[PDB]
Structures are given as C-alpha cells and as structure tokens.
Amino acid sequence: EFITVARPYAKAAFDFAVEHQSVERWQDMLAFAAEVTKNEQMAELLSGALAPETLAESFIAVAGEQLDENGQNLIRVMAENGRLNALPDVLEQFIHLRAVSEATAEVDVISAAALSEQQLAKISAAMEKRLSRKVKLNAKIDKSVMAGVIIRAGDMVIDGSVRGRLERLADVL
Amino acid sequence: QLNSTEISELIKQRIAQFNVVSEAHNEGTIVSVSDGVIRIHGLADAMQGEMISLPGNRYAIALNLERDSVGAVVMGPYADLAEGMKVKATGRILEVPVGRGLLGRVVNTLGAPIDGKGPLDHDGFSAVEAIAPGVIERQSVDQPVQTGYKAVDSMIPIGRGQRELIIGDRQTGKTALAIDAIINQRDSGIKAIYVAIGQKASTISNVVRKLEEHGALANTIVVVATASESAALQYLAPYAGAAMGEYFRDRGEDALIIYDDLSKQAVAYRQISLLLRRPPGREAFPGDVFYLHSRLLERAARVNAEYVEAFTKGEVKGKTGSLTALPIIETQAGDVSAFVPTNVISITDGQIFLETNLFNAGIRPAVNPGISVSRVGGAAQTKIMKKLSGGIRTALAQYRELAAFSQFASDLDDATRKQLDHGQKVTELLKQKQYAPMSVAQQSLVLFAAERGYLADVELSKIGSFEAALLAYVDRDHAPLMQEINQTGGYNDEIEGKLKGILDSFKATQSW
Amino acid sequence: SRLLERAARVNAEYVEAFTKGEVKGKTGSLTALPIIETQAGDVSAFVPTNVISITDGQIFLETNLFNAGIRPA
Amino acid sequence: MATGKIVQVIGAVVDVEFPQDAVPRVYDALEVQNGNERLVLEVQQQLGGGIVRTIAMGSSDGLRRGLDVKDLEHPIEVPVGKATLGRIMNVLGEPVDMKGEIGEEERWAIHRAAPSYEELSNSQELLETGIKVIDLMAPFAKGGKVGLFGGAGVGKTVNMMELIRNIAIEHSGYSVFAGVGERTREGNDFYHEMTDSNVIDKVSLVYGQMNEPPGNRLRVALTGLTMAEKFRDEGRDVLLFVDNIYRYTLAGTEVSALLGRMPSAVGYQPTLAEEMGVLQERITSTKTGSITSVQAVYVPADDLTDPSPATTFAHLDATVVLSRQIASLGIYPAVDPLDSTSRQLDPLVVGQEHYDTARGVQSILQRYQELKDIIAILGMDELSEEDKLVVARARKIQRFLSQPFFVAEVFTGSPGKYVSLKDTIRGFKGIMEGEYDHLPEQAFYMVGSIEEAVEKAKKL
Amino acid sequence: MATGKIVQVIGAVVDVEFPQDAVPRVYDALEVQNGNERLVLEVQQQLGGGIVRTIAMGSSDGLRRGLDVKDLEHPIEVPVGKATLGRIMNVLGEPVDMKGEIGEEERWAIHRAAPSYEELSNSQELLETGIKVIDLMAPFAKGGKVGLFGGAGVGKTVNMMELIRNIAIEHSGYSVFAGVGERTREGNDFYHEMTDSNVIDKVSLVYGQMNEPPGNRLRVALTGLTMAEKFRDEGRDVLLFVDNIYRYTLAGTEVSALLGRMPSAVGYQPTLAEEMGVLQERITSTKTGSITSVQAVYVPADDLTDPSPATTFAHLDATVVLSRQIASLGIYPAVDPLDSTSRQLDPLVVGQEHYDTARGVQSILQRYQELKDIIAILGMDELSEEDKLVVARARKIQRFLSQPFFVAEVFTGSPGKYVSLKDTIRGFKGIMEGEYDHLPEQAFYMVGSIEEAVEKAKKL
Ligand SMILES: Nc1ncnc2c1ncn2[C@@H]1O[C@H](COP(=O)(O)OP(=O)(O)OP(=O)(O)O)[C@@H](O)[C@H]1O
Ligand SMILES: Nc1ncnc2c1ncn2[C@@H]1O[C@H](COP(=O)(O)OP(=O)(O)O)[C@@H](O)[C@H]1O
Numbered sequence A: 001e002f003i004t005v006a007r008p009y010a011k012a013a014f015d016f017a018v019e020h021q022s023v024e025r026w027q028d029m030l031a032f033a034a035e036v037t038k039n040e041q042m043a044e045l046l047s048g049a050l051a052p053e054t055l056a057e058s059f060i061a062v063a064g065e066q067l068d069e070n071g072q073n074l075i076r077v078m079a080e081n082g083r084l085n086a087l088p089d090v091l092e093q094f095i096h097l098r099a100v101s102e103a104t105a106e107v108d109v110i111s112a113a114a115l116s117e118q119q120l121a122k123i124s125a126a127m128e129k130r131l132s133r134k135v136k137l138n139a140k141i142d143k144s145v146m147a148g149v150i151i152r153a154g155d156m157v158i159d160g161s162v163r164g165r166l167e168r169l170a171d172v173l
Numbered sequence B: 001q002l003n004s005t006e007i008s009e010l011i012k013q014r015i016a017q018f019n020v021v022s023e024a025h026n027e028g029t030i031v032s033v034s035d036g037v038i039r040i041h042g043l044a045d046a047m048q049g050e051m052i053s054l055p056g057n058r059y060a061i062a063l064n065l066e067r068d069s070v071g072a073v074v075m076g077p078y079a080d081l082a083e084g085m086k087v088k089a090t091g092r093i094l095e096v097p098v099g100r101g102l103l104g105r106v107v108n109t110l111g112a113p114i115d116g117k118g119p120l121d122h123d124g125f126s127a128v129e130a131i132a133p134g135v136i137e138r139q140s141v142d143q144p145v146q147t148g149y150k151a152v153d154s155m156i157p158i159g160r161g162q163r164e165l166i167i168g169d170r171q172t173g174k175t176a177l178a179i180d181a182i183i184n185q186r187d188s189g190i191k192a193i194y195v196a197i198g199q200k201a202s203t204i205s206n207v208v209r210k211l212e213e214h215g216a217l218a219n220t221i222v223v224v225a226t227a228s229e230s231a232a233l234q235y236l237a238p239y240a241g242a243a244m245g246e247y248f249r250d251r252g253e254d255a256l257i258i259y260d261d262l263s264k265q266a267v268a269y270r271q272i273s274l275l276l277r278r279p280p281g282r283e284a285f286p287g288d289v290f291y292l293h294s295r296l297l298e299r300a301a302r303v304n305a306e307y308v309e310a311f312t313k314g315e316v317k318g319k320t321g322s323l324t325a326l327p328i329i330e331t332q333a334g335d336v337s338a339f340v341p342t343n344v345i346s347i348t349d350g351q352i353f354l355e356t357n358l359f360n361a362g363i364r365p366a367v368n369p370g371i372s373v374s375r376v377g378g379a380a381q382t383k384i385m386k387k388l389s390g391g392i393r394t395a396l397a398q399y400r401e402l403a404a405f406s407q408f409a410s411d412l413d414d415a416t417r418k419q420l421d422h423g424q425k426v427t428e429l430l431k432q433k434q435y436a437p438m439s440v441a442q443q444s445l446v447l448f449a450a451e452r453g454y455l456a457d458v459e460l461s462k463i464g465s466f467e468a469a470l471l472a473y474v475d476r477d478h479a480p481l482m483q484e485i486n487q488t489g490g491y492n493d494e495i496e497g498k499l500k501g502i503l504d505s506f507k508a509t510q511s512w
Numbered sequence C: 001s002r003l004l005e006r007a008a009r010v011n012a013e014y015v016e017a018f019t020k021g022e023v024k025g026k027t028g029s030l031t032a033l034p035i036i037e038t039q040a041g042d043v044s045a046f047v048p049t050n051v052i053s054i055t056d057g058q059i060f061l062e063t064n065l066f067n068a069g070i071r072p073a
Numbered sequence D, E: 001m002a003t004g005k006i007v008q009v010i011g012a013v014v015d016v017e018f019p020q021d022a023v024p025r026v027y028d029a030l031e032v033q034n035g036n037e038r039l040v041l042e043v044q045q046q047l048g049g050g051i052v053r054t055i056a057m058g059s060s061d062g063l064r065r066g067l068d069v070k071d072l073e074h075p076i077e078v079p080v081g082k083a084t085l086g087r088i089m090n091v092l093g094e095p096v097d098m099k100g101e102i103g104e105e106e107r108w109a110i111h112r113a114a115p116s117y118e119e120l121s122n123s124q125e126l127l128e129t130g131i132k133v134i135d136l137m138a139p140f141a142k143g144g145k146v147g148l149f150g151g152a153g154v155g156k157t158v159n160m161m162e163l164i165r166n167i168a169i170e171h172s173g174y175s176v177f178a179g180v181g182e183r184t185r186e187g188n189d190f191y192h193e194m195t196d197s198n199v200i201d202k203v204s205l206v207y208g209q210m211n212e213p214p215g216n217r218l219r220v221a222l223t224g225l226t227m228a229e230k231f232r233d234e235g236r237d238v239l240l241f242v243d244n245i246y247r248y249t250l251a252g253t254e255v256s257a258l259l260g261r262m263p264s265a266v267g268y269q270p271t272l273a274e275e276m277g278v279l280q281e282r283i284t285s286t287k288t289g290s291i292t293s294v295q296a297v298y299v300p301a302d303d304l305t306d307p308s309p310a311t312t313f314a315h316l317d318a319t320v321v322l323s324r325q326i327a328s329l330g331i332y333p334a335v336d337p338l339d340s341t342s343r344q345l346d347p348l349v350v351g352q353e354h355y356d357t358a359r360g361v362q363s364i365l366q367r368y369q370e371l372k373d374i375i376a377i378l379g380m381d382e383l384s385e386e387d388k389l390v391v392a393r394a395r396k397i398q399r400f401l402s403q404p405f406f407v408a409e410v411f412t413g414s415p416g417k418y419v420s421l422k423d424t425i426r427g428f429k430g431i432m433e434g435e436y437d438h439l440p441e442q443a444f445y446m447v448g449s450i451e452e453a454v455e456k457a458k459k460l
C-alpha cells in the first residue's frame, strides 16, 4: 500500500488544477490513467526494469487523451521515481482533496430496505446540520440490518440497526 | 514505500514544464536541515568538493551528488537556515587563501581573520584537498630540525621533511613540547604553523599570547577551530593548515606544522559520517578514517629541486622545499593498542610517546624510551650529535625493563652499580624546564660529558646547578667555540681535544 | 544440522529395502568429522555454539598444550 | 494566528506541518493547546515539504493529530537579572515555587554562540574561595571549570552552600544553581537548607529533575547558563553550579535516540563532544566579567575512559575529590588532598612559593600514608626517630586543613572563617618547616589563620 | 564516441547511465574528461536501467553529474614483460618516473583466473635467510609464501628489507615489488637504494601509496601480481614482495558501503574472504615457473583475531608473527616464537636435529610463559631450583633470538650480522643443554653466532 507516496502527487496535481480552472478535467484524466494501470499486460510492463524514460514513453503512448501539462509531465515525474503503480491512490486522494475544498461530504447510508425519500431528505438536511457541508447520500440495501439504518460519515458512524441493538443488549447481559 | 525528497510544490514545478533545466543550472533551494547537514535541490552544475554559497556569508561543501539532490555540510552556524532559501554554486573547488602575508595572523579554517587586525594580505588561493607529491618527486630527509629539548634531540631526532607523532595521555606536555619547538624555530629560517583542533578558546588565547611574548608569533601562522565550532570546521581545519604549509613547501622554503589533536579531527569526522548514516566500523569510526589521516599527513614531504623548478615555472631554480609535520594524539589510559592511535602510528615516521607515570614522578619531558623511535634516525642529526648520542635509547629500553624486573635488590653487581647509576644520572640530566631551549652546542657538550663515563661515578645530584654553571662558564669566557660548533656541527679529534680540555678544566676547578 | 544429521548408522531392513534386495543383514554407516576454527579459544561464538550443540561430541585442541609439546594437543 | 498542524506523535517526538514558506527555523519554539494546558515544542530538524520535527517540553499525552500549532518566531526565552534571585524556575522560565510571579524586566534566548576570540579576557587570574584546602591544593581559575567527585554524606551540599555564601559576601557576585536530572527530594531539602541559612537571597535556582520529560532535562542547563550570562554582562563574577553534568549527557543521548540517529562509540549520541563543548565553551572569563563553574561529575562503572568522563575531563580545569575517610576523621571539609588536582598548580601560574608549599604538604601526607600502614602492623615504636617526627607534623597538617564555615554553625557553633590565600600559605609553611612544633595537634583543629591556632594553644 | 552520462557521484563511486543495448560488461574500463585531466572508471556492478556503478581510478573531485563518459570495451590492461623491469609504474600501468614511455610489446588484463589444480607444483627446497629466528622457527622453501604479521611500528618493513637484501640480491631471476598503500618516503628510499646498488635492472616496481584514492590502492596489488604472473609464465622463477596486503582489503572496505552492500562482522565487506582469496590464490608456483613471495600483513589494533588477519592466516605457508611486547624490550627481530610456524618445520623436510632444537626452544619458552604469572605475584624466589634453571635458559634464549641487521645499521650503530643455519642450531642446542649456563644474559643481546656471545661476555 502506498497512500503515503501518493499524497504529494495528489496534492501537487490538485493545487495545480485550481491554478488552471480544470479540476474536472484532471479528475477524469487521472481516472483514465488509473484504469490503464490495472491492465494485466501493462502491469507486467511496469514491473519490468526498463529505463524510467522509455517506460514513461511506453506509458504515454497508450493514453493520447491527455494534456501536455498532465500526462506528459505527471506521468514522467512519477516514472522517474517509479511511482506509477500509485496512480489508483493518487486518484482517490485527489478526489478527497477536492471534496475538502468544495465543502462536501460523501455520507453513506445503509438499510434493510429503501427509504421513503422523505426520510432520506430529512437525513440529508440533518447531516448537513450535524456537519458543515453539502452531503451526497448514497444508500445500500444490506439485509443483515433487518431494520433501521447505519449512517457513516467518514470515521463517524451512527448505528440504529436492530442487529446492533440486539448484540449490544446481548452484551448488557 | 518511502518518499525520496520529492515534495508537493517541486512536483508542481515539474508539472508546469518537465524540462525545468531550461532554468539556470547555477542555483538551487535548500530542502532540509538537520544537525549541520543540508540537502539541496537543483544545482545541476554542482561538482563534488565545490563551495556552495548560502544566504548571509556562509559556505557548504558538496559531499554527495545524488540522483536529484546535493548533500552538503555547513561551515558555520547552521541554525539560521530554513527550507526554500535560494542557494548559488560558486564554480570553485574548496579553496583557502594562502601566502606569506598570513604569517603572524590568527585565521578561521576558511582563512577569515579572527584577530582584530583587518583583512588578509594573501597571495592567492589553493585547494584544500590535494594529492601529495609522488614517489619520484620526493627527496631523502637529511637536514636537522633542532628543538629546545635535550631528550628529543638526542633520542628522537627530527629532520626537515619528517613526520613525528607526539602521542600521550592528557596533561603530559604534548602542547608544551610542540609550542616550545615553535618557539625554538624562530631565528632559524624555518616557518611554523599551529592548528588548534577542538581546543577550548582560553587555551588557544593563552598559547597565542605566549608565542607573541617570545617573539615567535611574527614567524608563525595560527589556525583556530575551537570546541564550540561546527564539526565540518574542525575536521577541515588541518587540511587548511596543510594547504598553508604546502605553499612554503612548493616555493622551496622550510615549514613546520603542528596539528594540535588529530584525535579530535577523527571524532568530528565520525560525527559527520554518522549523521550521513554511513555504516561504522571498529570503535564506531568510519572505514575511511585511515584515509582521512593518511591523505592529510603524506602531504608533509621534502621535494627535490626538479619539482620546485617544474612547479615555480623555473623562477626558483635549484632549491629544495619541505614541510615538517608534528601531529599530536591523545590516548586514553596510556594504551597505544587502540584504533586511531595505531592508525597514526602507522602513518607517521617517528613516534614520541609521553608517559604519564614519568610525568608524575617529575621526569619532564616524559619521553618514554623503547616505545619512542625515529624511523628516519641518525641521518636527521648533526654528526656531532649522531656520534655522541649513539644507541642510548636502546640502552634505556633495557635499563628500564631490567630495573623493573630486578626489583628485590641490586644482585649480580658486576657493573650494575655503574650501569644503573649512569642510567639514573642520564635520566636526571635529560630533565629540562619548559621555555628554556638549549642550543646544539650546549646539548653536545652536556651529552659528551655524560655518555662516555666522565660522570658515571659522581651521583651527587645537584645536577641542574652544575649544568647552569657549565653553560655560563663556557658562554662568558672559555668558548668562542660555541659560535663555531653551533654553526658547523662538526666532529673532529681536534675539537674533541678543545672541548675535553674545557671539560677537565671545569671539572677539576669547580666542585659542581 | 540438516547436513550433519545425514551422518547415520542405518539398520539392515532399511538397506534391504533401499537396494530392493541384493543386500541383507548388513548395516550402513556414514561417519562425519566436521572441523571448526575458534578465535582465541572462545566457544561462545555463533557457529561454534551451533555445531557444539548439534554433534555427539567434541575434541578440543588447545594451543597452550600444543606449544608445550603435547601433540596431539 | 496559528498556522501549523500536528501530523505525527510518537512518544515525545512531534511532527508538525507548516506552509511551504512559513517553515520555522531550527531552534524556534512552537506551542499547542493540549486540552487546557499549553505545551511548548522545541524544533530539532527541518524535513522536506514543510514538515518540522520537534521535541515536546512537557507531557505528550492527549495530543491529537491535526491540532493547531502556533509558531513563536524566537527560541525559548527565559527571564533574567536580579528578579530571579531566590526563586525556583523550570526550563521554560516559569515559577515552580509558589511565591507568585517573576517581575523580570528582560528575557533572553537560551541559545547563543560562545564569546568570540577577541572578546575573551587577555589575562589569567585566581578565584579566592576562602577555603584552605581548595585554595591551597586545588586553586580556582576565575572562569575555569571544577569537578566534584565525592559521593553522599561527605558534605557536598555544605561545600556548595559555603561557596555560594563566600562568592557573594567577600566578592560581590551572585550564583546560579542548575539541577539537571537529580532527585526531587534533594532539591526540596536543598532549598530548605539554603533558606535556613540566609543564602537563598543570593542564588537563583533552576530545576529539571528525573521525573521530567527528556527535553526539560536537556535544556535546563542552558536556562541556568543564560541566567549566569545575564549576570556576567552586568560586570559581575558569577558561580554556576551544575548538579550533575553526566545527566545532561545522558538526556542528550535519550533525545538523540528519539530522533533516530545512529549510535556512537559506546551507544552515546554521535554529537556528544559537540553537545558538551557547546555548553562548556560559554563558561569563560570575558573582559566584562566572568562565570566560574562547579560541576558534580559521575563516572559510569568507575571508568575514567568512558566517553562521557573522557569528554568532560577535557574541559575541567580543577578537580576536587571528597572522601568519606576524611569525614570519619571528623575533618570538614572532607577534601582528599592527595587526589584533589588543579592544572593551576603551575609555579609560573600561581608562583613558586605556593607551588612548593602544596608539593611539600602532599609529599608529607603521602609519606604519612605509608607510615600509618607500618604502624598498623608493627606498632608505633618500630618507626625510627625521623619517621616519628614526620608523623607528628603530618597529623598537624592533616588538621589545619579543616575549617569552620559560616553556614556550618548549626553543627559546630564556631563563627566560621574566611582565610586569605597568603595566610594559609604562611600557616602551612610554618607547620611544615618545623615552626609551631611546640603546640599540640588539637590547637590546629577547626581554626582559621595560624595566629588563631597559636592563640587557641594558649587558651588550651 | 562518448555514449554515457554520470548520474551520481558518491565519493569514490560513480553511477553512469548507458543505452540498454550498449551497457558495458562488469569489469570494463570507462573514461571521463574530468576538467582537463582524463579519469578512468572501472565498473563494479550492472544496475538495472542501463546504469552502472564504477570506482574512480583517480581523484573524484570536480566531477559534475551529466558529463559524457566513453566506453572502452576492454578491462584495465598494463604493460608486462622484459620492458617493465627497471621502471616504476602506476596502477593503470602508466610510467610514473620521469623517463619516457614503456617499450612493451604486450599488455595483460589485470583480472585473471588462478592456475588449475593439476598445474600446481610443490617444493621442499629449503631457502636460507640470514635471520636466526626466521629460519630456525619458521623455515620457508623456494616457491613458498611468507607472511609477516604485526601491529604498527613492530618491524614488518625492516624485516622485509632484510629479506630482500639477503635472498633477493644473491638471486638470479627477476623480482617484483608492489607498494600497496604504504609510505611514498619508503618507496623513494627503496628506489634510490636499488638504483645506487645497480640492481634496479632486475626489480620491477609498482606503487599505489597511501596518498592515492581508494581505487588505486584496491587495484595496484592486482597489477603488480599480473607482472609477476607474466614472469612466471615465461618459465622463470620470480620474487614478489607486497609491502602491505592489508591495504587492499581496507580499500575494499572503504568502497564497500557505497556500493550498497550490507555490512558484515566488524564493518568489513561481506565479500572479504572472496576478495582476499581471488588475489591470494593466483600468487602461486606452477609446473612452468615459481613465485617466491613475502607479504607484510598489518594487524589492526594489534588484534590477531580481527577478521582480516584471521582470514589471511590460512593462505600463507610460513607465518612470522611480530609482537609489540617483545619490541618494547628492544629485542629486534621482534618475532614471537610461540606463534610463528612453518609448513616446512617437519623432520622429513628439515631434518631431525633442526626439528628437535626448534621444538625444545618452543617448549621452554612456553614453560617460562607459564611461570610468568606466579613470578609476577609471588616473585621468583618461590620457584623450584628446576624452574629457575628453565627461566634463566628461556631468558638467555629470548636474548639470543635478537640479531643486528645491515638495514638497521642506521637506527643503531652495530654492524649487521649474517648467521648460517648451522651456527644458529649449534648455538641454540648449546644453550638449551646448559653448556653456556655461566654467561650473563647481556652476553647474548644483539650478537651473531654464539662465538660472538662468548666474546661479548669478556667485555661485559
Ligand atoms: N618540562 C616541564 N617541566 C615542568 N612543567 C611542565 C613541563 N612540561 C609541561 N609542564 C607543565 O605541565 C602542565 C601540562 O602541560 P600541557 O598542558 O602542555 O599538557 P598537554 O598534554 O598539552 O595537556 P592537554 O592534553 O590537556 O592538552 C602545564 O602546566 C605545563 O606548564
Ligand atoms: N563544614 C562542616 N562542619 C561541620 N560539619 C559538617 C561540615 N560539612 C559537613 N558536615 C557534616 O556532614 C554531614 C553530611 O550531610 P549532607 O551535607 O546532607 O551530605 P550530602 O550533602 O552529601 O548528602 C552534615 O549534615 C554535617 O553533619
């Protein structure tokens, strides 16, 4: 795992994208590179001890949909350091940074069944009061909850599932 | 998975345009600062050993040219520096100001004056790091360097172009013997240099004014790197002192240099090496350390006249130059079976070992025979001193070992009452007070009067008054010969008769 | 250990099975005499400790005896 | 306005991240709100990318990541001057006594360079301490370092209190006492014994004891020293007591290990001889004033070759050894005159008469040391007629070394005496060269000048 | 032409990047224009990306990264054969005296395989040296290896100069001397001794003295050994003197960490024993020619168990161990006879009388060693009247082992003595059986045969 190596590159890419008003394009560009990083043949090439320069050129070629500023520079700098396998994380970090500056939170909700869209809108407005961000709910239908909902807002979690209450009662006994 | 000093805004600069080399190769930026070691980014033009100029007026020495950054050490107070400071590469390999005009000045290891007397009248600059003259450019050391001391000049003779280790425990007269040699060298044309390494400033100030009192300071350069100062200054200081001595050497003159503790230079270099994370060896010293002292001390050399001609472009035709080094080493608890003492014993020519037991017992200077040697030997001496002093150090080697073994009584008294009274009489005669240098004439007549028996019977003691009378009686009346024998060093049966006539006249007339 | 534990005496049934007949009654043997060098007679070193732990016995040859003339020491 | 963020916390080491341009310098002090209490961090290294690695001058527990850190633009600063006399402070210059507040007019940073070469005093001078044994056998250079090697019970504390008293009353200086890495019990009882002797008004105390995080035990000595330096600039002669410099070395070793640097000769930090010299080089005489220092020294495993003693002895000018045998004899101060040493016993430095007087006393005592052993097995009457006299003079020299202290009256009642150097030279010349043979040995015991010895013999 | 670029410079080691289709092999030479000079690099490793790690055969200062380097496609090669006899050469085979170019017809790569096993030859032909202890205790044969072990200042070089004088002048074949990391002063004094003795026409000289950077010291032993191998293959018999082999391994230790290899037992490179054996195994006699060799082997800190001495001991045939204790006595040659040995000290090779004399000398010197601790505590009087006789004889033996040397004729005034094997066994056999029990110990110090000791006894 290489969160720690991806942090500098993500921060540099984002801090550059706001100097040139193209965060939205950079995100899709990094997502394209992160997908090319996963291929079975390309992952065999990245493991191979080619010279950083020719390995970078062998990586530029498979992605022409890329700015001069973005691909031909970021990919080369990451190749000189041998960091290209970090791209899937440089993406996620980038997204996160964006969500930070845009004052947004990707709250996740989990339930045994669909919510009434009044429950869910109340959840949105209430989390937006609990936090200080525009929330973006996404639901999951997990049956083991059976009733109630889990609201996860990053490291904070609120558990109202009947299974959670049952197992807590199990440990009050 | 670890980072390698690539950081957000440098990556952003590379993002702006990959070929940032379109910017100047002449400069860079500090990236980190830790314990006097510095990491710099940029400086594509930097070359190893180069002086890098920092904001303010400070320099760093480029030690490492790595894939993307330069590792350097700061020659001064480093705490004032911070990330992002712009830094410029002077295209100069580490160089110190040098010249005859430095004589009588006290200067930092960079040749910045430290007395209050203003700027330097230096001749030019010379590289601090250099490779000593090759095997074919040397010449045999065959000229004396007389010291003040009767013991060393008789037992452990030093010649112009020799290297003499002065090794001993703390507070045994290592500095006293070296500065008293510097004092004796004035009025003999050989220059001197004193390099204080890791010394406390009160002591350096004391010896500087003590050299000024005796008139020696006008003859000598003093290089000071006190105990408070950055380790890069301490280990670089002896190479600057050698770079100053080497100028006189290459101009066909004579110079003498004292490195006032190589054993602190080694510790400063160990600090610099362990801060750079290099694997240490025995006693945690780096593997380099022998190369550290060797490349420094082999520079002290005597060169033939063809080398002086080829160097000075013909200007000095037909004179031979030399640099005479006397490094000091301090050893814990008197053992020489230690890594750094044995390293320097392996490099230097001779060895003066000063012993703590003798020093406490009042035998000063405490030159321990048997362990101390001169690998140049008699060729350094004036032939009078050579012929008179013969083999006495080996005689004392056995006299010491036998008086140590035969402790119960003076049994088997064949001649041991003569031998051991002679060895006591000689050890008592070699004792000498500091700052009282004896000319070669005075040493020669005293050692003549001692060595071939003429006073082995009279264990009167009272010896110091007998000598102080003898040298006055010959100075005032008996010997115009003093001016002659101090000039020629000649040994002749005619002069032996002249001197033995004086010896019998004094020994008959004066009851000590 | 996996080198030295290969020196073994082997019973007649192992020999008779290994050779698929053609030998009977006889026992096989391999005897190993490893040699180790110690620095100034210290046994507390690493490799001397391991090999002294593995083997069935030790013949200690000492320089103080060898110098005195007791040979083999 | 706070600008940094805590990014790591590992033991006492805290990493904080700043904007790329606002990075603090090396020895700057930051601070954090650790709950309600504020906490001070001293920077130690600048890492890449705005990260800065610091050591906490306090308890590290309770620190979150992401806490706001405020960058003070200067190093640790402490109060200085007269205002600090009689107080007790910690490293940060905060009163740990409870007498309220320090009304200092000025504050000084604890980090600075030693005096320049042209600034040192172009002279060498002695410090008349007023104690016979020290003034005779181990004189003090004004601006020198002195080691104390005795154990416990030997009266070390009373020696320090007598020095604190004499440097103030007879001279006109002050004193600073820096207790680094020592028991809290001893500092408490030392404070009580100094206030019960009216010397507390003349000494300023700083404490970092064993119960303190490493950074406090590291920087307390520099706090004490920078107060002594403020006294120096005023033109005075100052005494600085370091209650155990070996613990300063050992706390530097602990901090070095925490920062992750490679271990040096015996596990000590690689920067040992620098960290020691950076302290000991500020204790010098200057052509405005002077700081003399008395440092209690501890030798690990009784090894004078260990890197810590070996580095400390390079700096010491004098060495006073305290022995329990001399105390069992009821002789105070219990200074051992045979092992006590000073490099100022140089006949050119102190004069021929003083030098030869000290050498004679020492020779007499080390002859008596063997005659005592002969007596112990053969009886008194085996000694020749000459030895019986050197014994009679040795037993008198050995007692003229004792002295009454102004601070020891609570034990002996005697008014206490300050003896000038030339007067003890006279007295020991007398006793040594057979004069004053005609009075009993008890006439010398616990007395001042030798005229008081003859008058006591009269009364006796 | 120039096809590669520098990408790193760490002290003595340099990293160079090449196209992946042209990367050099693992011992090729490379060339760089360092300022105005020409610097040769020897490649030690192939890293992955067309990069290559090399050691600089010269001063590394002044090297920028990004310089162009030129790929010489052959290893380092040195002149060899008759042409190289009366001359001094660099590690690169370049002439270092001021004479013209070398007139060689052939050049050899300095990295070569050792001779095969069926090609070796072994000889029993005892070679006589003037030195009583060396041939009595550790006699060595023609075509064997001699090694001199000692700390610093014990006599290694003076003894090697005596061996050169006593064998190498009254010897027919050519000779090779390699100075590996020793003093240039001694190399100049040797070269002028040879040239003023008109024997220089037979002695090829190579120097890589202790002022040179690590690469020259590392390779210079291999380039000297190549010249010895060439003279061996011509069918001649050759003398090879190596003035400190330890420096070869030390230069490897200095380089080893920079090449990225994990340190071993006491710091040494992991490859210490292979680096040493690859050199040592090819200095051997074969069926076409023989090399007789004397190596000085410095032992650091006098520690005979340091890995480098310990791993060197296995290679040699005769090992002479010098010791500082005996030299402190002044008994030169300071051979320890209880540690020196030879392969040739067998009764079938040497003969029974020699073998018995040498074993008796060892036996009584060992018995004296066993007595020394009880002599130190109790004193000699307690010994048996048998024990005192073996002590007196062992001490007389220790004196008679000393000998004056024609080369030590400038450290002492005594004339040098040459002692034949017959006279030394005749004297040691005489001493052991007590026929000289009446002479004093000083009669044996620094004499030749025993008939000089009987004369010296008369003059006391
Ligand atoms: N020949 C002598 N006779 C009398 N006193 C001497 C003699 N030589 C030196 N001394 C004195 O002994 C003391 C020790 O000498 P010095 O301080 O030079 O020793 P050192 O080994 O240089 O000290 P350090 O190791 O601490 O640098 C000094 O006071 C010096 O004056
Ligand atoms: N100058 C002196 N006069 C009389 N008694 C003394 C003197 N110095 C020390 N003592 C005695 O020695 C004792 C030692 O105790 P203390 O000073 O507490 O030892 P430490 O300070 O080493 O712990 C004192 O309490 C006192 O009884």
Ligand SMILES: Nc1ncnc2c1ncn2[C@@H]1O[C@H](COP(=O)(O)OP(=O)(O)O)[C@@H](O)[C@H]1O
Residues within 6 Å of the ligand: B346, B373, B374, B375, E150, E151, E152, E153, E154, E155, E156, E157, E158, E159, E332, E333, E403, E404, E405, E408, E411, E412
């Ligand atoms: N036979 C001898 N006579 C006198 N001195 C000797 C003798 N052998 C060795 N020495 C002393 O040994 C010292 C160093 O010898 P050297 O060969 O240079 O030692 P190494 O080379 O082992 O360091 C010289 O000063 C020399 O005087």
Ligand SMILES: [Mg+2]
Residues within 6 Å of the ligand: B171, B173, B174, B175, B176
């Ligand atoms: Mg000194």
Ligand SMILES: [Mg+2]
Residues within 6 Å of the ligand: B346, E152, E153, E156, E157
């Ligand atoms: Mg040698």
